[PDB]
Design a protein around this nucleic acid. Structure first.
Length: 49
RNA sequence: GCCCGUCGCUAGUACCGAUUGAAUGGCUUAGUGAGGCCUCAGGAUCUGCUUAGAGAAGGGGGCAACUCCAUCUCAGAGCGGA
């Protein structure tokens, strides 16, 4: 139970918790850093047309 | 009073008009003005009835050419009509 439960957090509510997108994790892909971080969809969708 | 009121950004929402580039419509200025009508001329062209000249077929008479009129083609003088 120790080795399988290291990447977990002990929050209490799904709507009253906080998370980060840039957390360090071995389960995270190495190419996640090589991914585009697009801000807003509809603005660049209108821009690209 | 008073609260959600400044700052720059993400898109949207109404604007003005100092703006040009066209086009539409109505008043107005000046000039041009098609087409038909009526009217003044014009006369490509055609054509009817009189009267001149040249040719034929017919009959009557000098009986020998020649003469009288009868029926047609071309060219003139006309009056004309469209």
């Amino acid at each position: 139970a120790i080795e399988r439960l290291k990447r977990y957090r002990g929050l209490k509510n799904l709507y009253n918790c906080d998370w980060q997108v840039d957390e360090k994790d071995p389960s995270s892909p190495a190419e996640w850093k090589r991914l585009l971080r697009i801000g807003n969809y509809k603005n660049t969708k209108n821009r690209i047309i």
